[PDB]
Amino acid sequence: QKLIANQFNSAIGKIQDSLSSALGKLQDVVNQNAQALNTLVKQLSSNFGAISSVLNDILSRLDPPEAEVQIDRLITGRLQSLQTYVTQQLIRAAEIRASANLAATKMSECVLGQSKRVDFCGKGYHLMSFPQSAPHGVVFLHVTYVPAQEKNFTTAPAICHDGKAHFPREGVFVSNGTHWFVTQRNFYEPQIITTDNTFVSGNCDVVIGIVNNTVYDPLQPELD
Amino acid sequence: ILPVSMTKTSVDCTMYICGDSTECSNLLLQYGSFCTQLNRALTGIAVEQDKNTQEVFAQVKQIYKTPPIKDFGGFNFSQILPDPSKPSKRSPIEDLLFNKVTAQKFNGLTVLPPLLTDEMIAQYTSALLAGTITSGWTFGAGPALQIPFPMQMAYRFNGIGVTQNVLYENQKLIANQFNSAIGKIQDSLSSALGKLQDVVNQNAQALNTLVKQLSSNFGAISSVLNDILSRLDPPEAEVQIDRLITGRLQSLQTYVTQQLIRAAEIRASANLAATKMSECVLGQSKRVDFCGKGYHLMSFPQSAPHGVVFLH
Amino acid sequence: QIITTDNTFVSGNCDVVIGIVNNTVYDPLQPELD
Amino acid sequence: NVFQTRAGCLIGAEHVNNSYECDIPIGAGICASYQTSQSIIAYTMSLGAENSVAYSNNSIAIPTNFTISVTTE
Numbered sequence A: 001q002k003l004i005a006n007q008f009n010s011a012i013g014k015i016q017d018s019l020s021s022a023l024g025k026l027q028d029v030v031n032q033n034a035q036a037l038n039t040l041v042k043q044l045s046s047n048f049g050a051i052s053s054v055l056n057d058i059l060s061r062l063d064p065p066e067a068e069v070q071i072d073r074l075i076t077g078r079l080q081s082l083q084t085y086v087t088q089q090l091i092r093a094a095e096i097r098a099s100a101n102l103a104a105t106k107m108s109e110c111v112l113g114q115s116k117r118v119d120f121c122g123k124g125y126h127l128m129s130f131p132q133s134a135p136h137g138v139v140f141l142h143v144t145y146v147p148a149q150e151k152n153f154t155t156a157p158a159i160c161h162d163g164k165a166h167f168p169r170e171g172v173f174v175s176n177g178t179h180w181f182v183t184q185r186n187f188y189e190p191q192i193i194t195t196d197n198t199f200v201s202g203n204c205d206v207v208i209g210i211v212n213n214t215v216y217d218p219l220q221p222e223l224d
Numbered sequence B: 001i002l003p004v005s006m007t008k009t010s011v012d013c014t015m016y017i018c019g020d021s022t023e024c025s026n027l028l029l030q031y032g033s034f035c036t037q038l039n040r041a042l043t044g045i046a047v048e049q050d051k052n053t054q055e056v057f058a059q060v061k062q063i064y065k066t067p068p069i070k071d072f073g074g075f076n077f078s079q080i081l082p083d084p085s086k087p088s089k090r091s092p093i094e095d096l097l098f099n100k101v102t103a104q105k106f107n108g109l110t111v112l113p114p115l116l117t118d119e120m121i122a123q124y125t126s127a128l129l130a131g132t133i134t135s136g137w138t139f140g141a142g143p144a145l146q147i148p149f150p151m152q153m154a155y156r157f158n159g160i161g162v163t164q165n166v167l168y169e170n171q172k173l174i175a176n177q178f179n180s181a182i183g184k185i186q187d188s189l190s191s192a193l194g195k196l197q198d199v200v201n202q203n204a205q206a207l208n209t210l211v212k213q214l215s216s217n218f219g220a221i222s223s224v225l226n227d228i229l230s231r232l233d234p235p236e237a238e239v240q241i242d243r244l245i246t247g248r249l250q251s252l253q254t255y256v257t258q259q260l261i262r263a264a265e266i267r268a269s270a271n272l273a274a275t276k277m278s279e280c281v282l283g284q285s286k287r288v289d290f291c292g293k294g295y296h297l298m299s300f301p302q303s304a305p306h307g308v309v310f311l312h
Numbered sequence C: 001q002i003i004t005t006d007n008t009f010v011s012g013n014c015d016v017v018i019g020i021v022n023n024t025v026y027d028p029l030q031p032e033l034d
Numbered sequence D: 001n002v003f004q005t006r007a008g009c010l011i012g013a014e015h016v017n018n019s020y021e022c023d024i025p026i027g028a029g030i031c032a033s034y035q036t037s038q039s040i041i042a043y044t045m046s047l048g049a050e051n052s053v054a055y056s057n058n059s060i061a062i063p064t065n066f067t068i069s070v071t072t073e
């Protein structure tokens, strides 16, 4: 318990030291909106194929019966930019809706409970998450489970004791050269081969490769 | 069949709208704000087209070499592994899909090459297939381990409700059914795909439409701007040049908008393929009827031109 | 349910948890061997 | 200096046969970086750590330790 508590506090300090040194997903949505708003003010500085940019300049030098064509070119020229800015914002709104629905599914699975889908809330076995507030977004601090050290052991698919094959339920039979233990595929926990973790089915001569191993039989010495 | 990327096209306004004259460049300064938006939109497509490949194929940062031991307990893995008889990294299957699915740059419609070619995508699928047959799921969620295939199939059966005692009783039966399933897919694919062809036919018809837009007049006396300048003076034919510019600007605004919807459909399929890569390939997906019709055990992803295939 | 053997298991020693209490086991195997 | 790459022409950067992790994407499987004085070099990017995984029918690997990490999305 003191090892997991120390590894959790070191993981929070490594994220806080990395975030203090900018983000990309929370900056591209702002830079695209800032350049789109700066483009609309630049559209008012163009003429769209006319003699002036603003409609107030042509009305002071020419009569509206004469400059009616230049006004319609500025209206249709600004209507094309208004139809472009709305269409460009609708694709960005669909990208926001696609990311908000993806974040809502991750909130109901990674945060609200344990997500059974592996490699979904991040690289590694997800346990839980800690969502925090973000400007125009949201962040997630998941708790992953990745292995660091490992060793190689000789395994066996079944155990032949008296003519019947023994198959495990959650773990796998391991051996480091002279002994025989059983452990899961996620953590090394050596245990004695007992009856409560194994079962019998059929005969022994069903596997192409099998070895001979004895059972501790934790029920025999108790009835004496 | 799920696509992850498509072709990259970079359209200019000055090469596509204006030809070989200086009178078109004077009127293009009034529409320079429209090309700042169209150039940034086509630049945003090319980065998104190169970022979707790094989210599906680049799941791990280690290249897993294929083991020389081909004895996997009666299973035939020569169809998914690259054979050393050919210099290419594609397997027989991957090579059958390259020839199954099938100038445009003369009018300024140049095609930019992607970041990763077909050889590096084939190397990414062979690296994921080497880690699946040797570690299964620990290589995508941590460091690499070693585990035999049969033992690996016993853990995939436990996720759907099947105990692992029946696997070791008919191991020669399931190994013969697995080799018969690969031969049935290879015989069906050798006889075209739909999801990998509509993304190419829509881009081919859109590129053939832009060259046809140059053959129209847009309500004028000529199509090209070089014809009216030889018969009329630019002070007189200034209205005909502006009608050809706003006529081509409407087609350029339509081609960029049509490509952005196709880029959103590619992004929606690449994110769907990335979730299937991390669940059906990288481990066992607990969601039933997600990786196909039936109880999913594992998958075998291969390389595809402008896409990716999955053999669950 | 009564604390039995079929639902529990042992691993290591007792002095591993920072907070623990003393409790007895029903042992549903002892009265059957008599 | 001048290197005829598969994606066009990259000039002003020498080519090296060694492969490292690239940062600036260029295209066609070749990147451009600044390594060792030090000059801008162009080389083929590495697809990952080239390592061999020992596969056997009677060998398993069980992890004995773990590290609790936080993935920021």
Ligand SMILES: *[C@@H]1O[C@H](CO)[C@@H](O[C@@H]2O[C@H](CO)[C@@H](O)[C@H](O)[C@H]2NC(C)=O)[C@H](O)[C@H]1NC(C)=O
Pocket: B076, B077, B078, B079, B092
């Ligand atoms: C695995 O499948 C391949 C099919 O590609 C088998 O290769 C064929 O083997 C037969 C038998 O000699 C030959 O007649 C064919 O010419 C082979 N085809 C190719 C493309 O090589 C291979 O034998 C199978 N392996 C096992 C162990 O069944």
Ligand SMILES: *[C@@H]1O[C@H](CO)[C@@H](O[C@@H]2O[C@H](CO)[C@@H](O)[C@H](O)[C@H]2NC(C)=O)[C@H](O)[C@H]1NC(C)=O
Pocket: A003, A006, A007, A010, A149, D064, D065, D066
């Ligand atoms: C698993 O790894 C952790 C992290 O390195 C080990 O914890 C360290 O243990 C050493 C000696 O026991 C201490 O000096 C360090 O201070 C510990 N670090 C932390 C962050 O707690 C742990 O011992 C390893 N466990 C095994 C079984 O190898």
Ligand SMILES: *[C@@H]1O[C@H](CO)[C@@H](O)[C@H](O)[C@H]1NC(C)=O
Pocket: A176, A177, A178, A179, A190
């Ligand atoms: C590893 O093998 C040695 C051989 O004598 C044995 O003493 C030791 O107990 C084994 N390791 C474990 C964890 O049982």
Ligand SMILES: *[C@@H]1O[C@H](CO)[C@@H](O)[C@H](O)[C@H]1NC(C)=O
Pocket: A208, A209, B071, D057, D058
């Ligand atoms: C593993 O395969 C080799 C090669 O066929 C064989 O000699 C060996 O007996 C096999 N091991 C087991 C445990 O079946």
Ligand SMILES: *[C@@H]1O[C@H](CO)[C@@H](O)[C@H](O)[C@H]1NC(C)=O
Pocket: A160, A161, A163, A210, A211, A212
């Ligand atoms: C011990 O293993 C050998 C080889 O698998 C087998 O022939 C023999 O019957 C086994 N011994 C017993 C008592 O089952």
Ligand SMILES: *[C@@H]1O[C@H](CO)[C@@H](O)[C@H](O)[C@H]1NC(C)=O
Pocket: C018, C019
């Ligand atoms: C709970 O925490 C309090 C505060 O430290 C402590 O006094 C108490 O003993 C704890 N209870 C248990 C069961 O550990």
Ligand SMILES: *[C@@H]1O[C@H](CO)[C@@H](O)[C@H](O)[C@H]1NC(C)=O
Pocket: C020, C021, C022
């Ligand atoms: C009862 O609990 C106390 C406090 O945890 C402990 O010191 C004592 O050893 C326990 N009794 C037995 C018989 O274990």
Ligand SMILES: *[C@@H]1O[C@H](CO)[C@@H](O)[C@H](O)[C@H]1NC(C)=O
Pocket: D015, D016, D017, D018
């Ligand atoms: C890199 O090494 C290979 C090894 O044969 C050689 O052929 C090639 O010319 C070298 N390239 C450079 C740029 O030195």
